[PDB]
Amino acid sequence: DSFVIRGDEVRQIAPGQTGKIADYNYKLPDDFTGCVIAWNSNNLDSK
Amino acid sequence: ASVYAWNRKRISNCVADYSVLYNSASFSTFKCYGVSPTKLNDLCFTNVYA
Question: What outcome is documented for mutating residue 11 to S in this protein (chain A)?
């Protein structure tokens, strides 16, 4: 699953977690199996 | 206040929504103990202090 978010919201993308990104558009299962991988993209996605 | 001095508001006789604070971009932490910040709106207390 591939997408962009503001850096403050990276902590919402987990099993069990809650917030506007975790509720309203990207919810993980509360027993998720897998990895969440992220890096800053300020060199590509900012203008 | 200075951290040696720290004032203490007592909150009483009133209604509050805690989700307004929990969804705010203002805060660098929100760590909760003995209650969860998602649950506070469903639950209530004799005094609250800040």
Answer: In strain: Omicron/BA.2, Omicron/BA.2.12.1, Omicron/BA.2.75, Omicron/BA.4, Omicron/BA.5, Omicron/BQ.1.1, Omicron/XBB.1.5, Omicron/EG.5.1
- For residues A19 and A27, the answer to whether their CB atoms sit within 8 Å is no
Any CB–CB contact under 8 A between A24 and chain B?
Answer: no
> HEC string of chain B?
CCCCCCCCCEECCCCCCCHHHHCCCCCCCCCCCCCCCCCHHHCCCCCEEC
B10: which strand partners? Answer: B49
What is the number of other CB atoms lying within 10 angstroms of the CB of residue A21?
Answer: 19
Look at phi and psi of residue B27 and say left if phi exceeds 0, alpha if psi is from -120 to 50, else beta.
beta
Does any CB of chain B come closer than 8 Å to the CB of residue A30? no
